[PDB]
Amino acid sequence: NLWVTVYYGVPVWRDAETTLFCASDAKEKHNVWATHACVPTDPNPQEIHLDNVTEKFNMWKNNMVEQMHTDIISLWDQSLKPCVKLTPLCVTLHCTNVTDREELKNCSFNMTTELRDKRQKVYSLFYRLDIVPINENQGSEYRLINCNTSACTQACPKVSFEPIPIHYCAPAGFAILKCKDEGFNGTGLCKNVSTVQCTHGIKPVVSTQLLLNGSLAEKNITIRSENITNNAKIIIVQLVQPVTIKCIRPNNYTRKSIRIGPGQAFYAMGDIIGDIRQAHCNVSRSRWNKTLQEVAEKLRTYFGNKTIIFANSSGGDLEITTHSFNCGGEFFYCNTSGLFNSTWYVNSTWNSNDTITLPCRIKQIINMWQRAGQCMYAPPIPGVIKCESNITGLLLTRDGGKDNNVNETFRPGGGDMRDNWRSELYKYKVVEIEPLGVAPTRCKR
Amino acid sequence: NLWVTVYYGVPVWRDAETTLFCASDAKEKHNVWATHACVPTDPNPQEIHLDNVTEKFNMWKNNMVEQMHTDIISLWDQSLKPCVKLTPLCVTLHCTNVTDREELKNCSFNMTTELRDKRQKVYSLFYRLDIVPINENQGSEYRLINCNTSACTQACPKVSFEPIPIHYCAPAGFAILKCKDEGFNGTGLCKNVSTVQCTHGIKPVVSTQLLLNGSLAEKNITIRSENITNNAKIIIVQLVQPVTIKCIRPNNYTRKSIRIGPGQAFYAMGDIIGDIRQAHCNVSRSRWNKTLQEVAEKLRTYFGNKTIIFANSSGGDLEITTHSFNCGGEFFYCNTSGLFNSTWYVNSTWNSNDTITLPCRIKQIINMWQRAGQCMYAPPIPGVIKCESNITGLLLTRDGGKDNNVNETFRPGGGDMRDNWRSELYKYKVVEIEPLGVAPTRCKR
Amino acid sequence: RRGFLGAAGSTMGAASITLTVQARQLLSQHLLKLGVWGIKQLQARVLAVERYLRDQQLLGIWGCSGKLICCTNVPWNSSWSNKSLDEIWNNMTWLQWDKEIGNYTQLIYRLIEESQNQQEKNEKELL
Amino acid sequence: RRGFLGAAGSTMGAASITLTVQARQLLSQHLLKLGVWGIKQLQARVLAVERYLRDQQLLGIWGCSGKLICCTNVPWNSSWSNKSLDEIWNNMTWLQWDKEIGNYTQLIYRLIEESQNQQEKNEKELL
Amino acid sequence: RRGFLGAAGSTMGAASITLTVQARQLLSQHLLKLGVWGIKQLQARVLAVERYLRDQQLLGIWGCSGKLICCTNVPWNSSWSNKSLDEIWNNMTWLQWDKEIGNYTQLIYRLIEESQNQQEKNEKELL
């Protein structure tokens, strides 16, 4: 006959929700992400490729992306907690033009000094974007953009916003499955699965409409979406060639410190050395539109013989209509109307520097989560900063047309960075190992 | 043949780093150290002396002293967290002379009352040390010493600064080794080792240049240092006879309470009953210089036939140059020039009250950790306060001479409070028991 | 030899060899800051401890604690699976076998517990 | 009789008698305030639980859970120690023996695990 | 059949049947907020883990881990209870029996530990 037996440590797993702990190369300025606070990374992550295994993946229904979003916002609030707040800076500022070149404003306002009975008069430079007047008729009196919503918190200068790679390790009894399929679109069954205890280097860089310093594709351009035909769903694309970009801040600001209270200081720009220079970015037009041609021919496989046309941003909020990123502590906002301005036909071929100049905007008062409050005031970085990033993917949003036309327009898609984390966690899924296996055999012999 | 076997609960240990939990006597006023929150102490600590055991000890490379320092500063910040802060007391004070006797100053300043639209005018007495003028030419206008660095926090009167002993117990699987060697210098191999789960009564009293209420030596004066020849290293000495000291506060202050805001009060000295009397301390000169003679002859064994000379500390920070302690809530700063002023030869012999008068200074605004901020304002204790201590050890600092002379000068050592805990944790070391033992035997019979 | 979770695609007759690598990996800066990462680390450690103890108490009450494979007195029921004696040990992996008996795990656990308790009651406690 | 950790200086042949006092001491105001002492207390308790479970899972997978002393199928190798059969059990203590085999603990653990798993695989699972 | 803790009023001879329901219940929103209920939940889970491990380490060192009922080498002493062999197994419940031997639990535990350790020392370690 047959008797039931129990197997301990059996190799089975089920999809479940669980917490995750950090892992990084802890060693020194601390980093907003508190990478030194978590567990130090292993010298070499043990990665094993499972043979004869086919597993179903779903990058849109994954729980790691939501957990990662909650952990990043929690670490952000944690980092801003011991720092000084901007509660006394809501005074009516007096700004005029600086000595296009009208973006900066030379402000002047009153401020309470360390003495509770005395005050101090200071001056600082603020951008027009983070400046809002009381009324549209007076003129020369302005306020902060986030004053009637919440009080911003000045970031501590002892920490840096460098995107330090963090490894999202799984707890004991749990594992992370990796899909090594060539050109996997992120949804369906994977024919080449691998397992690992901790994920690879995940840089929590913040980007909009473009993916900076992301993971490059394996062999071809991959388009990821749960429903490509659905117009309300976002579209994530990946590139095989890292499109370089050079973003600099030509303005040479002078960091100054003023004491707004006992034991607290406020940092702002004093003056500018030289002259006014508009911040911009550079990109090779040949490689950029060559990759655009590859993306168009890849999209041609899903929309048939229709021609792919790219348009600029629709309009509205500056955070979703412009490509933003944190460059060495300074938040950038570049206009992408020169990168999504072209059309591609079926017989079209892209066929020297010829760089493209992309105008950019700088904002110190940012929210970075689309929340109704809890803003952050980015401190000014002294000197001239320069940033170089590897463009590996972008976000797309198709216009809600009738679809019967020969052409459809695409716009630079936006989001709350959840899709950005999805673009890096698509290859990973969280499972729960059940070491209790049940199987019968002819025992009792 | 031989087969490998596994032994469970084997008696081996290795040096490791681990957390520790408190153990106080459960008993009422809470103590700044929150000793009522930790586990109650055992009725009798089980201490076992290991026979045939010789273990190497290193008091300077121990981790318990660093962990203890972090725990004490953490408890200090914890105790000051629910209490009221001194943020509105940074107003320009107006102080004059009181009605030497010029140490105290009768101040008068404006202060916001419980009503948000009204203020109040109060007066209080403050020491000259915790008073700093705005400029050196105006006169009669002063500020607090810690106003441009941070805002101090008033200590809660519901808790006391009594140095109640605490037992640093080890977690399960860990143990604390004790060295019962007679006259052990704190560095090397111990020939009489004992083990215990929890340390003895450790009073976390904070003192500089002198060890108050410490552990007395066993048989002879012991000098502890990792490198006695190195001039940059601190020197810790222990005494066999408890040198008594009587420190009093003859000023009879009147505690007054003023409401600086809704639901918060500030305590300060109202007036003085009687007359101005300088605070001082008493010590028997015979016993003190007899112990000094013993320390000199003990130091003679390390520096050869050279003569030992004691001199006062070099000018600088008041927390280091003077001896500090506390008498139930009042901080003192006594001048040690009256004690470290003598010379001892090889043939010298010390051979009635004759007490020594040591002038002392009292400060309310203290940092007690040499930090750039996070100060504490000690509330004034009403009535006359007097505390008696047992001088068991001191800290020394040798001058960087050429060493070829017949005499070398010794200064009162001090600095960080790490040495205070190191002078009590020298006899203890933290180990980790590994119950997994490997040993072969002729089994399978 | 394969590493951790490297024999999942193999058949049940061959995947029961490297079970020690999965059994060993069930549990594997000293000061804790109790921050965002600290709280998650503590929660992960407590959850791992609870998971190991929860899956270990079953083996403890089934009379097979400390044993990777053991046989009990509960006979197999054909209602759970109509397959033969060795068609699963030679052609099916553990991934396609756990879903077929997933609806009867609780029933098997209860029968196993009552049979083991009855066996211990009849063996021990002579009078 | 000696107390907790009282036979460390004795030889290995005699120190294996009071092992129960060290085995028992491996785990030994109700409301928690979660303060400085509360957080350290919770961390110490969790660390003690993790230490006990980490050193207990080895005995669980080695087929010797709940036993203070047991013998396995792995033979001793002279490369780890060239000493005789009883020179360590009559003249050397446990403190001077753990350092000689400290570089081969992982190798012995892996060989022990594979031998125990192979023995359970050959004994159980008849067909 | 009775549920959890349903045979307390029954005699000791019959209450030792459903012991598996009490043994199984000794351990039985993913993100923790660490609030008032979160801290209490974590403390309750840690306390439950500590209670189970504290009562399990005794069975582990007594040579009866993973067994609900076992017999040792320690003989019964008439000083603890002068009752007969079966008057408690047929007429007294477990509620009126725990208080009669409550003053001798520590002594029985120490004798049990020393006897079990002595038995393991004499059985194992041939030379």
Ligand SMILES: *[C@@H]1O[C@H](CO)[C@@H](O[C@@H]2O[C@H](CO)[C@@H](O[C@@H]3O[C@H](CO[C@H]4O[C@H](CO)[C@@H](O)[C@H](O)[C@@H]4O)[C@@H](O)[C@H](O[C@H]4O[C@H](CO)[C@@H](O)[C@H](O)[C@@H]4O)[C@@H]3O)[C@H](O)[C@H]2NC(C)=O)[C@H](O)[C@H]1NC(C)=O
């Ligand atoms: C995608 O990834 C790339 C490659 O990592 C990033 O490019 C880096 O950007 C960071 C800023 O985000 C740059 O770091 C900054 O460089 C300046 C000086 O660095 C020089 O010296 C160091 C010496 O260690 C070299 O490593 C480095 O290569 C340079 O030669 C300074 O502006 C900054 O110094 C900061 O710290 C010091 C110390 O406190 C302060 O005094 C400064 O004021 C300042 O705070 C900083 O180190 C880095 O150089 C860039 N690398 C390269 C290769 O260009 C991209 O930013 C990233 N993309 C995105 C969007 O994040």
Ligand SMILES: *[C@@H]1O[C@H](CO)[C@@H](O[C@@H]2O[C@H](CO)[C@@H](O[C@@H]3O[C@H](CO[C@H]4O[C@H](CO)[C@@H](O)[C@H](O)[C@@H]4O)[C@@H](O)[C@H](O[C@H]4O[C@H](CO)[C@@H](O)[C@H](O)[C@@H]4O)[C@@H]3O)[C@H](O)[C@H]2NC(C)=O)[C@H](O)[C@H]1NC(C)=O
């Ligand atoms: C080294 O160790 C010695 C010995 O322990 C310490 O000396 C003690 O110092 C503390 C203060 O730090 C003294 O305690 C204070 O005594 C005063 C009243 O005490 C009387 O009543 C008690 C009742 O039992 C008698 O034991 C005692 O002899 C006296 O008759 C008050 O100043 C204090 O009371 C405080 O608390 C109450 C309650 O809130 C308040 O109402 C008071 O206003 C006040 O705040 C306090 O009790 C103690 O008496 C000293 N002992 C001896 C033997 O002299 C040293 O201080 C210590 N050295 C260092 C550097 O810490």
Ligand SMILES: *[C@@H]1O[C@H](CO)[C@@H](O[C@@H]2O[C@H](CO)[C@@H](O[C@@H]3O[C@H](CO)[C@@H](O)[C@H](O)[C@@H]3O)[C@H](O)[C@H]2NC(C)=O)[C@H](O)[C@H]1NC(C)=O
């Ligand atoms: C914004 O407006 C402020 C206020 O007018 C400007 O700050 C001041 O700028 C002037 C002109 O550069 C500086 O004056 C110079 O200072 C010294 C000492 O007097 C000396 O080099 C010259 O004689 C000259 O006067 C001045 O230092 C500076 N600050 C203050 C506190 O007076 C600021 O430059 C304006 N910013 C921009 C971007 O236009």
Ligand SMILES: *[C@@H]1O[C@H](CO)[C@@H](O[C@@H]2O[C@H](CO)[C@@H](O[C@@H]3O[C@H](CO)[C@@H](O)[C@H](O)[C@@H]3O)[C@H](O)[C@H]2NC(C)=O)[C@H](O)[C@H]1NC(C)=O
């Ligand atoms: C610091 O200065 C203040 C302000 O001058 C002093 O407080 C005042 O002290 C005087 C005595 O020196 C008090 O006068 C007496 O008060 C009562 C009521 O009038 C009565 O006993 C006498 O008739 C006499 O007038 C005065 O009231 C008091 N002011 C307040 C508001 O309390 C303080 O004494 C000075 N401190 C020191 C140490 O000198």
Ligand SMILES: *[C@@H]1O[C@H](CO)[C@@H](O[C@@H]2O[C@H](CO)[C@@H](O)[C@H](O)[C@H]2NC(C)=O)[C@H](O)[C@H]1NC(C)=O
């Ligand atoms: C699964 O995909 C990985 C790559 O993602 C393959 O690994 C490659 O194997 C070839 C042939 O041995 C090597 O030359 C490459 O260096 C490997 N690449 C990497 C990135 O490691 C793997 O072979 C695939 N597995 C199967 C079964 O097809």
Ligand SMILES: *[C@@H]1O[C@H](CO)[C@@H](O[C@@H]2O[C@H](CO)[C@@H](O)[C@H](O)[C@H]2NC(C)=O)[C@H](O)[C@H]1NC(C)=O
């Ligand atoms: C990603 O690839 C999967 C297959 O690996 C696609 O899923 C199929 O989608 C078609 C659409 O017509 C359905 O008919 C099939 O039933 C789907 N197969 C499975 C197994 O679900 C998915 O559409 C792809 N997505 C993109 C954006 O290319």
Ligand SMILES: *[C@@H]1O[C@H](CO)[C@@H](O[C@@H]2O[C@H](CO)[C@@H](O)[C@H](O)[C@H]2NC(C)=O)[C@H](O)[C@H]1NC(C)=O
């Ligand atoms: C994916 O989106 C497509 C359209 O983009 C859905 O297909 C039809 O959608 C229209 C509305 O656009 C509905 O009226 C039809 O009922 C849908 N047809 C079917 C057969 O569902 C489609 O449902 C979406 N989902 C999937 C899984 O393909």
Ligand SMILES: *[C@@H]1O[C@H](CO)[C@@H](O[C@@H]2O[C@H](CO)[C@@H](O)[C@H](O)[C@H]2NC(C)=O)[C@H](O)[C@H]1NC(C)=O
């Ligand atoms: C966006 O594309 C349009 C064409 O679709 C560009 O407009 C042409 O610009 C050139 C100079 O670059 C002019 O000589 C042509 O007359 C323009 N054509 C039309 C129809 O207006 C436009 O410059 C592109 N913009 C960017 C930023 O690349």
Ligand SMILES: *[C@@H]1O[C@H](CO)[C@@H](O[C@@H]2O[C@H](CO)[C@@H](O)[C@H](O)[C@H]2NC(C)=O)[C@H](O)[C@H]1NC(C)=O
């Ligand atoms: C930004 O301005 C500062 C302030 O003038 C520059 O720093 C000076 O650079 C010169 C270069 O010759 C050095 O000689 C000086 O010692 C620097 N310091 C000062 C205080 O003058 C800085 O170089 C400027 N940055 C750029 C990129 O031009």
Ligand SMILES: *[C@@H]1O[C@H](CO)[C@@H](O[C@@H]2O[C@H](CO)[C@@H](O)[C@H](O)[C@H]2NC(C)=O)[C@H](O)[C@H]1NC(C)=O
């Ligand atoms: C280790 O030192 C301790 C003291 O630190 C010695 O214990 C003393 O032993 C004598 C002789 O039996 C007793 O009279 C004393 O009362 C003990 N002192 C204490 C403080 O308990 C112990 O004997 C020493 N051990 C060895 C092996 O020399």
Ligand SMILES: *[C@@H]1O[C@H](CO)[C@@H](O[C@@H]2O[C@H](CO)[C@@H](O)[C@H](O)[C@H]2NC(C)=O)[C@H](O)[C@H]1NC(C)=O
């Ligand atoms: C404490 O005693 C130890 C010995 O028990 C001393 O260590 C010696 O230090 C000297 C320094 O020149 C070395 O040459 C010796 O080799 C050390 N001996 C041993 C056995 O390690 C240590 O210096 C003493 N410290 C004090 C302050 O007296």
Ligand SMILES: *[C@@H]1O[C@H](CO)[C@@H](O[C@@H]2O[C@H](CO)[C@@H](O)[C@H](O)[C@H]2NC(C)=O)[C@H](O)[C@H]1NC(C)=O
């Ligand atoms: C202890 O300090 C002494 C001096 O106080 C060190 O001995 C010499 O120190 C001088 C500088 O004062 C160096 O130039 C020599 O190289 C040192 N000599 C040696 C042999 O090291 C000594 O090194 C220190 N450390 C110890 C462990 O004794």
Ligand SMILES: *[C@@H]1O[C@H](CO)[C@@H](O[C@@H]2O[C@H](CO)[C@@H](O)[C@H](O)[C@H]2NC(C)=O)[C@H](O)[C@H]1NC(C)=O
């Ligand atoms: C400090 O001053 C206070 C206030 O005068 C004194 O307290 C009084 O002491 C006398 C002594 O005869 C008592 O009769 C009074 O009842 C006390 N209270 C008041 C409110 O007057 C206190 O004694 C003084 N302390 C010292 C040491 O002289």
Ligand SMILES: *[C@@H]1O[C@H](CO)[C@@H](O[C@@H]2O[C@H](CO)[C@@H](O)[C@H](O)[C@H]2NC(C)=O)[C@H](O)[C@H]1NC(C)=O
């Ligand atoms: C410090 O020691 C010196 C001597 O080294 C003392 O100075 C002597 O003090 C006495 C009175 O105490 C005078 O009669 C002598 O004339 C002084 N001698 C010299 C050479 O100046 C000094 O008093 C001591 N100080 C203390 C506080 O004890």
Ligand SMILES: *[C@@H]1O[C@H](CO)[C@@H](O[C@@H]2O[C@H](CO)[C@@H](O)[C@H](O)[C@H]2NC(C)=O)[C@H](O)[C@H]1NC(C)=O
């Ligand atoms: C300083 O230490 C001595 C002992 O070295 C303490 O004197 C003892 O005090 C207790 C108090 O309960 C008395 O019972 C003892 O009889 C005293 N012993 C001796 C030998 O006199 C003294 O109390 C300590 N001083 C302080 C301030 O704590």
Ligand SMILES: *[C@@H]1O[C@H](CO)[C@@H](O)[C@H](O)[C@H]1NC(C)=O
């Ligand atoms: C599983 O993969 C292994 C490794 O290549 C191979 O030997 C075996 O035949 C495969 N089994 C099946 C059923 O495909």
